[PDB]
Short mmCIF file of N, CA and C in Angstrom, two decimals:
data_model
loop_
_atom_site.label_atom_id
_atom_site.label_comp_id
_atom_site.label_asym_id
_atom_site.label_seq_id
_atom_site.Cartn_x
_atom_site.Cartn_y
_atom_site.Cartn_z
N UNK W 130 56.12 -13.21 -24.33
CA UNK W 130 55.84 -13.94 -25.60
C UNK W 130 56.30 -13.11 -26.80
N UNK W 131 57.59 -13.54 -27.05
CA UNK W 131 58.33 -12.57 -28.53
C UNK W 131 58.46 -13.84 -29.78
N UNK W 132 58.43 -13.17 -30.84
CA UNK W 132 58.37 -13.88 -32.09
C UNK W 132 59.90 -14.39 -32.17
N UNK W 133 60.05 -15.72 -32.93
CA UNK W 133 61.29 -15.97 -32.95
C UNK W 133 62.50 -14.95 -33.84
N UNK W 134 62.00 -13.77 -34.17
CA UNK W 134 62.29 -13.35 -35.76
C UNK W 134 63.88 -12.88 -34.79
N UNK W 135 64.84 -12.74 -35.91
CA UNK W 135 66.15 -12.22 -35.81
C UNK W 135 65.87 -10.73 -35.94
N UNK W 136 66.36 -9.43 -35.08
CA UNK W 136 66.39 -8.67 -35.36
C UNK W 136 67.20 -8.07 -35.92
N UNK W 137 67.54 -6.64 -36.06
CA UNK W 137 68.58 -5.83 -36.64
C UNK W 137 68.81 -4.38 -36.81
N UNK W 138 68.59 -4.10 -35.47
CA UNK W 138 68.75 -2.97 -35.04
C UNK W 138 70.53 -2.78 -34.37
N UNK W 139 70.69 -1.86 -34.38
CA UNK W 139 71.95 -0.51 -34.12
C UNK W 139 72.71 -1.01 -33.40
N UNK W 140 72.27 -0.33 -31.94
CA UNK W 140 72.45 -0.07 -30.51
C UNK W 140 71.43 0.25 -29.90
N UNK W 141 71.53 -0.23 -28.25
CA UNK W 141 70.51 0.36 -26.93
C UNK W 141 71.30 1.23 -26.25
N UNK W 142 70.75 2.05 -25.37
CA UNK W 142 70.91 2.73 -24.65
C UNK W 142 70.09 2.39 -23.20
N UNK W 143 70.76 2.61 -22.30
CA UNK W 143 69.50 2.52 -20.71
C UNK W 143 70.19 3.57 -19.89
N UNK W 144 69.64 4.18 -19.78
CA UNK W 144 69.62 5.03 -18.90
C UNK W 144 69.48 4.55 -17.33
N UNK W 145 70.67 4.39 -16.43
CA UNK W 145 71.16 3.55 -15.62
C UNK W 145 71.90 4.45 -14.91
N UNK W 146 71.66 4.32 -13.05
CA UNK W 146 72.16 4.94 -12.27
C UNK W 146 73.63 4.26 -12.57
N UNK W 147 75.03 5.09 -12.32
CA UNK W 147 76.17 4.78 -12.23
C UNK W 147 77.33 4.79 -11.67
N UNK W 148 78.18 4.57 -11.24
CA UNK W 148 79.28 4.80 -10.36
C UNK W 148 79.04 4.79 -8.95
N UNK W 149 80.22 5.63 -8.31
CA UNK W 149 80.12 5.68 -6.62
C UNK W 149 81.16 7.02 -6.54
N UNK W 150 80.57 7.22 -5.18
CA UNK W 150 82.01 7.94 -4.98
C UNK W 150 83.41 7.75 -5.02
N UNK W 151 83.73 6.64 -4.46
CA UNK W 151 84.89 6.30 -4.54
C UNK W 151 85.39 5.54 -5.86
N UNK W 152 84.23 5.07 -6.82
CA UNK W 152 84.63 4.96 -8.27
C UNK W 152 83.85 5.85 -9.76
N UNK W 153 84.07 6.84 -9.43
CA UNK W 153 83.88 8.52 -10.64
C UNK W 153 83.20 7.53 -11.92
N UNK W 154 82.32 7.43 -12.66
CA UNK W 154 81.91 7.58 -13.95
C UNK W 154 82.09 9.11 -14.41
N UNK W 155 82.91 8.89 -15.83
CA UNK W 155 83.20 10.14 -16.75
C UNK W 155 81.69 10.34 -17.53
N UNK W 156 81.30 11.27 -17.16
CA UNK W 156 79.96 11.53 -18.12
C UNK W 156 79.95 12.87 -17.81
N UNK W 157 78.89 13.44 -18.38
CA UNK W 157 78.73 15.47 -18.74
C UNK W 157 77.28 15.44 -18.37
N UNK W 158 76.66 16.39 -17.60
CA UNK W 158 75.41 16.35 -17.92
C UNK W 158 74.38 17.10 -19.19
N UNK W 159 75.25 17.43 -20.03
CA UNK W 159 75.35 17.27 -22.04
C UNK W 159 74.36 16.01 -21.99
N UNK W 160 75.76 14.99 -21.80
CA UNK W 160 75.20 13.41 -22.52
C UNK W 160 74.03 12.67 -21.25
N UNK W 161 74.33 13.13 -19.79
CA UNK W 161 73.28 12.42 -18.61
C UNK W 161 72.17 12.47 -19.23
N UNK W 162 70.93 11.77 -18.66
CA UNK W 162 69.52 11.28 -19.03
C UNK W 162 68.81 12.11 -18.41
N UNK W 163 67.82 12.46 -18.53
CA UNK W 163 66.45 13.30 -18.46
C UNK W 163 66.12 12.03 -17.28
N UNK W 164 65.17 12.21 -15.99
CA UNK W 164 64.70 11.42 -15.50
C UNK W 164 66.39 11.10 -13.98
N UNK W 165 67.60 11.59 -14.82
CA UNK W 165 68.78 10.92 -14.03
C UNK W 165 69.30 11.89 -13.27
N UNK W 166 69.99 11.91 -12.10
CA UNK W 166 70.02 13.04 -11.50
C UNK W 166 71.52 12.24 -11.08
N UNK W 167 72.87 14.07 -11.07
CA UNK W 167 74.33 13.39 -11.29
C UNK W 167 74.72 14.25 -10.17
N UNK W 168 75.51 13.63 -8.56
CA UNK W 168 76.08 14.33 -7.72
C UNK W 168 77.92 14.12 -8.04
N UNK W 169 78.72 14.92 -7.11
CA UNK W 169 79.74 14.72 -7.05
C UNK W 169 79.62 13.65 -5.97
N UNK W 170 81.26 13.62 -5.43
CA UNK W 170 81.93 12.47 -4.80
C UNK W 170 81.34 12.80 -2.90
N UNK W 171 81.21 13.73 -3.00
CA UNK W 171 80.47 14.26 -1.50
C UNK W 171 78.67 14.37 -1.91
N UNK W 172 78.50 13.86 -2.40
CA UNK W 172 77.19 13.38 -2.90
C UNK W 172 76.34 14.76 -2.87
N UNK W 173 76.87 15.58 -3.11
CA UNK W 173 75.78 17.47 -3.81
C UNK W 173 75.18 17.36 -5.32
N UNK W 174 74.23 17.24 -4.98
CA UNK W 174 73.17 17.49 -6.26
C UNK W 174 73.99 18.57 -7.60
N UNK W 175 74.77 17.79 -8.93
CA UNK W 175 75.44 18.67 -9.63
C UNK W 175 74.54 19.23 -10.74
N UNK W 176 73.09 18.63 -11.35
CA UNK W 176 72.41 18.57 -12.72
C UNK W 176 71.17 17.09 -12.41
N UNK W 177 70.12 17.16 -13.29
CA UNK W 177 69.35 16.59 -13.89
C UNK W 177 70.33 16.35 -15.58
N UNK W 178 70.25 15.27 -15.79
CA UNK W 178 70.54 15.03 -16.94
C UNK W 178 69.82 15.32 -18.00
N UNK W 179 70.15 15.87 -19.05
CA UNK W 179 70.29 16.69 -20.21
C UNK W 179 69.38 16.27 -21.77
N UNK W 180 69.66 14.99 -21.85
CA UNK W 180 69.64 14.01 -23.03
C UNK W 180 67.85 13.47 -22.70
N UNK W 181 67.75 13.07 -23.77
CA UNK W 181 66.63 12.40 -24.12
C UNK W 181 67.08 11.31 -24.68
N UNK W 182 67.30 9.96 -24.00
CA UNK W 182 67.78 8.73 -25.31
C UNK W 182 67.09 8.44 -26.13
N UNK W 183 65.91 9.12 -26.69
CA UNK W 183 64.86 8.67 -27.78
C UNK W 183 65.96 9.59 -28.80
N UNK W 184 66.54 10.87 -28.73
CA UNK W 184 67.07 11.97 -29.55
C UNK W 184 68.28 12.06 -28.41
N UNK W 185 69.17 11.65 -28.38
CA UNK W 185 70.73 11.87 -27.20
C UNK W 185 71.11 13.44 -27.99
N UNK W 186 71.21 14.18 -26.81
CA UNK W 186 72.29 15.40 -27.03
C UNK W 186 73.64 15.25 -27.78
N UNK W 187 73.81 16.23 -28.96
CA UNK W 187 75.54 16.65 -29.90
C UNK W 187 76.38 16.50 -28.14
N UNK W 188 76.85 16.04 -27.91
CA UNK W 188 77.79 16.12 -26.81
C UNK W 188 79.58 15.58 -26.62
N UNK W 189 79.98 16.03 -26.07
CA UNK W 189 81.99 15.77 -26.08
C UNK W 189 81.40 14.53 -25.26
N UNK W 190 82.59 13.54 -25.42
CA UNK W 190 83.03 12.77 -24.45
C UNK W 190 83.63 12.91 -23.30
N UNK W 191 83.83 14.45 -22.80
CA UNK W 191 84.31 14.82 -21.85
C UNK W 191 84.22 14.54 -20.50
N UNK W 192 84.49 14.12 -19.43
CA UNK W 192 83.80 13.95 -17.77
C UNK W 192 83.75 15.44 -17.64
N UNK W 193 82.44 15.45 -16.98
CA UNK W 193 82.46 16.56 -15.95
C UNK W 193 83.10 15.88 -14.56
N UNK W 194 84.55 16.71 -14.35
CA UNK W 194 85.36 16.09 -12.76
C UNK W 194 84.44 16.79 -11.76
N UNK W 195 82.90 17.10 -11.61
CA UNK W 195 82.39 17.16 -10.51
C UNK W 195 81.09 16.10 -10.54
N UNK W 196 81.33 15.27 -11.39
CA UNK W 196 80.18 14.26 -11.25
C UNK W 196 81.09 12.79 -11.16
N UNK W 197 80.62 12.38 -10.74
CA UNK W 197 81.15 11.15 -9.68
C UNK W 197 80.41 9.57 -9.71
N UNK W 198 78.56 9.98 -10.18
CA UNK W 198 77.62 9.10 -9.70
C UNK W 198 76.02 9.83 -10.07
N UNK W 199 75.24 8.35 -10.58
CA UNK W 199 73.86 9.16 -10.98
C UNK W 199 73.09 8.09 -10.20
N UNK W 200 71.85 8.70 -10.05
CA UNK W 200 70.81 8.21 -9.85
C UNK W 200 69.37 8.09 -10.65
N UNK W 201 68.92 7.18 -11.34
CA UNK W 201 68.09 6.76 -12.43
C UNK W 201 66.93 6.26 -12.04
N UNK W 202 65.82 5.92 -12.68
CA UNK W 202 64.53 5.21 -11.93
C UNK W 202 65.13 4.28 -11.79
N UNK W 203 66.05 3.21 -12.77
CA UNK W 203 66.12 2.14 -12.79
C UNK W 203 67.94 1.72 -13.09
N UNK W 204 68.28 0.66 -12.40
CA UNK W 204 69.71 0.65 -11.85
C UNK W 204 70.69 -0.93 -12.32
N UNK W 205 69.76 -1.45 -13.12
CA UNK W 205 70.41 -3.08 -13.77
C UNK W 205 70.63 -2.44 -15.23
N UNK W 206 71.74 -3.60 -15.34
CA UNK W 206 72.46 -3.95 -16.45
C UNK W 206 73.39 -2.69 -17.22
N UNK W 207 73.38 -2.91 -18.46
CA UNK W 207 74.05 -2.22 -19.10
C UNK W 207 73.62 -1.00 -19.68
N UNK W 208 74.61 0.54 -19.81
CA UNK W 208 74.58 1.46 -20.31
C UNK W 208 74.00 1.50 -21.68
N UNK W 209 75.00 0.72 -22.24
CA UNK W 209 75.23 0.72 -23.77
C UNK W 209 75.14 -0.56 -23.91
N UNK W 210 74.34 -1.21 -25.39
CA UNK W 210 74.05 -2.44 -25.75
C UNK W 210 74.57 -2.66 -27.11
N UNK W 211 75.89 -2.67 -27.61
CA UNK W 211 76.34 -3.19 -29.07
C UNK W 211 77.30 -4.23 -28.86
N UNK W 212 77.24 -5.02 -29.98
CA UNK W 212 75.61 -4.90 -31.04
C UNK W 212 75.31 -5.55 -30.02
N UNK W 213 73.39 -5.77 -30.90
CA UNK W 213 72.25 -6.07 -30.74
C UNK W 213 71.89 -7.69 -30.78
N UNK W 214 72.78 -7.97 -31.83
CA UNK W 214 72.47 -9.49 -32.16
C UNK W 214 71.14 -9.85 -32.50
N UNK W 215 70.75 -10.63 -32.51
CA UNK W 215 69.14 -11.11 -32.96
C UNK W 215 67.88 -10.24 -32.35
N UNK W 216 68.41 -9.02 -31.19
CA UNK W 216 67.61 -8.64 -30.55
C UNK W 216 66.88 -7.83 -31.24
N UNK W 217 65.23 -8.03 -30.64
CA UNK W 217 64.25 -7.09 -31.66
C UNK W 217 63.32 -6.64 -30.39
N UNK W 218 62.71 -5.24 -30.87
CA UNK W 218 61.79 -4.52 -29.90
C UNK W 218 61.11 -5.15 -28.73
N UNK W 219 60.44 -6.30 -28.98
CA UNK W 219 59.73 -7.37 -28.17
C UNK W 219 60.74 -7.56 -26.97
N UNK W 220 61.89 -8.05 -27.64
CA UNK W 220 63.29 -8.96 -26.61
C UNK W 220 64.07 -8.40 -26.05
N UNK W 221 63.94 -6.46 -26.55
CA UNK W 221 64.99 -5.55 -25.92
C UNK W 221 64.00 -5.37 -24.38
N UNK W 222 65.09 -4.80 -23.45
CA UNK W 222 64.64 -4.37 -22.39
C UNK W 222 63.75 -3.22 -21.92
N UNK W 223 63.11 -3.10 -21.13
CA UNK W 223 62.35 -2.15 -20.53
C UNK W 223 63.41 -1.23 -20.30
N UNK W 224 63.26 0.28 -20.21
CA UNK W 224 64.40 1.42 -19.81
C UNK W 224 65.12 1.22 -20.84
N UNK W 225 65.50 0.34 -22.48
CA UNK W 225 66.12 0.64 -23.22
C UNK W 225 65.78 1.11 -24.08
N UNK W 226 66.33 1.73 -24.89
CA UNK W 226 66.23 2.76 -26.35
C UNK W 226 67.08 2.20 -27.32
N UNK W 227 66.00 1.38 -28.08
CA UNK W 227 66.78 0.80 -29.72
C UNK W 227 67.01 1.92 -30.77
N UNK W 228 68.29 1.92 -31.56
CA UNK W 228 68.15 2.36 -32.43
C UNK W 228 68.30 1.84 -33.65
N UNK W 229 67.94 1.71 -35.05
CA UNK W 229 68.25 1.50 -36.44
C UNK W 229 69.78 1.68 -36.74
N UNK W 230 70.21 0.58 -37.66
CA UNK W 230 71.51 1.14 -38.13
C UNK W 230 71.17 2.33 -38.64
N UNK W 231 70.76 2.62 -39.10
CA UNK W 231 70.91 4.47 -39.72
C UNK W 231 71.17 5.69 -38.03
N UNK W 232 70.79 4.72 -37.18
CA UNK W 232 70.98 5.84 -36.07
C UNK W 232 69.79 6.51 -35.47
N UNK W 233 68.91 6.44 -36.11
CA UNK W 233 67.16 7.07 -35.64
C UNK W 233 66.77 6.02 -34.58
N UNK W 234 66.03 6.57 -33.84
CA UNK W 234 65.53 5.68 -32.72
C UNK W 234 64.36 5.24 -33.36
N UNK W 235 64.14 3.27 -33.36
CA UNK W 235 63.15 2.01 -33.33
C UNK W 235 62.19 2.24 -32.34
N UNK W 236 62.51 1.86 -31.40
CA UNK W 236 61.35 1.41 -29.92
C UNK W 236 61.96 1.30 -28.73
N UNK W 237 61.61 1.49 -27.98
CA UNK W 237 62.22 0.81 -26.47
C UNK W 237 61.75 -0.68 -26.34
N UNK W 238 62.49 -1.38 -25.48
CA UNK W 238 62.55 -2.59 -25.41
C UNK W 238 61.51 -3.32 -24.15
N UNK W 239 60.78 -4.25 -24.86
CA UNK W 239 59.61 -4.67 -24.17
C UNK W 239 59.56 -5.52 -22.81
N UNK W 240 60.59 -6.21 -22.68
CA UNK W 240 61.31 -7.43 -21.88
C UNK W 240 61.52 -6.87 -20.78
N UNK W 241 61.69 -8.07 -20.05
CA UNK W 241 62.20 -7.84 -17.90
C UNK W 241 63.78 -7.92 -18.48
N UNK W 242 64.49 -7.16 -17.58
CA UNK W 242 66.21 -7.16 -17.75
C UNK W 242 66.50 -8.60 -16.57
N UNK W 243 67.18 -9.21 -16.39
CA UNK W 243 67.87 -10.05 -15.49
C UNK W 243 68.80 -8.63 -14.75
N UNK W 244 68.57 -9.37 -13.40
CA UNK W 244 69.23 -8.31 -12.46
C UNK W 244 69.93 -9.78 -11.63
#
Protein backbone atom coordinates (compact mmCIF):
# COMPACT_ATOMS: atom_id res chain seq x y z
CA UNK A 1 0.00 0.00 0.00
CA UNK A 2 2.12 3.14 -1.52
CA UNK A 3 0.74 6.65 -1.93
CA UNK A 4 0.03 7.65 -5.43
CA UNK A 5 2.66 10.60 -5.07
CA UNK A 6 5.32 10.95 -8.08
CA UNK A 7 8.66 10.62 -6.81
CA UNK A 8 12.08 12.15 -7.52
CA UNK A 9 14.83 10.65 -6.54
CA UNK A 10 18.46 10.03 -8.43
CA UNK A 11 19.27 6.48 -8.88
CA UNK A 12 19.05 2.79 -7.12
CA UNK A 13 21.49 0.61 -6.58
CA UNK A 14 20.93 -3.42 -5.59
CA UNK A 15 23.36 -5.13 -4.72
CA UNK A 16 22.86 -8.35 -6.91
CA UNK A 17 24.74 -11.58 -7.39
CA UNK A 18 26.28 -11.34 -11.08
CA UNK A 19 27.72 -12.99 -13.97
CA UNK A 20 29.08 -16.64 -14.54
CA UNK A 21 32.02 -18.07 -15.37
CA UNK A 22 31.78 -18.36 -18.69
CA UNK A 23 30.25 -14.70 -18.85
CA UNK A 24 33.01 -12.28 -16.54
CA UNK A 25 31.14 -9.14 -15.00
CA UNK A 26 33.84 -6.18 -14.93
CA UNK A 27 33.65 -4.99 -11.35
CA UNK A 28 36.66 -4.34 -8.53
CA UNK A 29 36.10 -5.36 -5.20
CA UNK A 30 36.67 -1.23 -4.55
CA UNK A 31 33.09 -0.88 -6.03
CA UNK A 32 31.61 -4.95 -4.91
CA UNK A 33 28.97 -4.82 -1.97
CA UNK A 34 29.53 -5.54 1.64
CA UNK A 35 27.26 -8.67 2.27
CA UNK A 36 28.61 -9.87 -1.71
CA UNK A 37 31.20 -12.24 -2.05
CA UNK A 38 33.35 -12.13 -5.80
CA UNK A 39 35.15 -15.55 -7.16
CA UNK A 40 37.08 -15.95 -10.34
CA UNK A 41 36.09 -18.11 -13.38
CA UNK A 42 37.29 -21.45 -11.47
CA UNK A 43 35.03 -20.30 -8.81
CA UNK A 44 38.09 -19.37 -5.75
CA UNK A 45 36.86 -17.11 -3.26
CA UNK A 46 38.69 -13.55 -4.65
CA UNK A 47 37.14 -10.69 -1.80
CA UNK A 48 34.00 -9.79 0.18
CA UNK A 49 32.91 -6.71 -1.41
CA UNK A 50 34.12 -3.42 -0.31
CA UNK A 51 31.26 -0.74 -0.72
CA UNK A 52 28.47 0.09 1.37
CA UNK A 53 25.56 1.24 -1.18
CA UNK A 54 24.14 3.50 1.56
CA UNK A 55 27.95 5.52 1.06
CA UNK A 56 29.54 3.43 -2.41
CA UNK A 57 33.40 3.48 -2.33
CA UNK A 58 35.74 6.60 -4.59
CA UNK A 59 36.39 3.66 -7.01
CA UNK A 60 37.89 3.21 -10.99
CA UNK A 61 35.70 1.57 -13.29
CA UNK A 62 38.24 -0.88 -13.70
CA UNK A 63 37.48 -5.01 -13.81
CA UNK A 64 39.38 -6.84 -11.58
CA UNK A 65 40.36 -9.82 -14.55
CA UNK A 66 40.21 -12.24 -11.52
CA UNK A 67 36.60 -11.75 -10.73
CA UNK A 68 34.30 -13.34 -13.00
CA UNK A 69 30.95 -13.63 -10.68
CA UNK A 70 29.34 -12.61 -7.20
CA UNK A 71 27.26 -13.98 -4.90
CA UNK A 72 24.65 -11.64 -2.92
CA UNK A 73 21.78 -12.43 -0.39
CA UNK A 74 19.62 -11.56 -3.09
CA UNK A 75 19.84 -12.30 -7.02
CA UNK A 76 16.65 -10.45 -9.14
CA UNK A 77 16.58 -7.66 -11.23
CA UNK A 78 18.66 -4.85 -11.80
CA UNK A 79 22.14 -3.50 -10.66
CA UNK A 80 21.55 -0.03 -11.39
CA UNK A 81 18.07 1.77 -11.57
CA UNK A 82 18.17 5.21 -13.79
CA UNK A 83 16.21 7.08 -13.76
CA UNK A 84 13.74 6.50 -11.23
CA UNK A 85 10.66 7.83 -12.82
CA UNK A 86 7.75 8.35 -10.46
CA UNK A 87 9.47 5.91 -8.14
CA UNK A 88 9.40 6.84 -4.39
CA UNK A 89 10.78 5.00 -1.16
CA UNK A 90 7.44 3.04 -0.59
CA UNK A 91 7.59 1.68 -4.57
CA UNK A 92 11.43 1.22 -4.68
CA UNK A 93 12.55 -2.30 -4.04
CA UNK A 94 13.70 -4.23 -1.12
CA UNK A 95 17.84 -4.70 -1.49
CA UNK A 96 17.67 -1.21 -3.21
CA UNK A 97 19.45 1.98 -2.26
CA UNK A 98 17.71 5.33 -3.42
CA UNK A 99 19.55 8.17 -3.86
CA UNK A 100 18.57 12.14 -4.12
CA UNK A 101 19.53 14.05 -7.14
CA UNK A 102 22.20 15.70 -5.10
CA UNK A 103 23.68 12.10 -4.77
CA UNK A 104 23.20 11.45 -0.81
CA UNK A 105 21.43 8.39 -0.07
CA UNK A 106 17.07 8.71 0.55
CA UNK A 107 15.96 5.17 1.76
CA UNK A 108 15.98 1.77 0.55
CA UNK A 109 13.10 0.63 -1.25
CA UNK A 110 10.06 -0.87 0.47
CA UNK A 111 8.41 -3.13 -2.36
CA UNK A 112 8.64 -7.05 -3.54
CA UNK A 113 10.95 -6.89 -6.88
CA UNK A 114 9.17 -9.13 -9.72
CA UNK A 115 11.50 -12.00 -10.36
Amino acid sequence: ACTRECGNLGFGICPRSEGSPLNPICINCCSGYKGCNYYNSFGKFICEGESDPKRPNACTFNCDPNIAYSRCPRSQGKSLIYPTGCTTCCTGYKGCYYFGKDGKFVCEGESDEPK
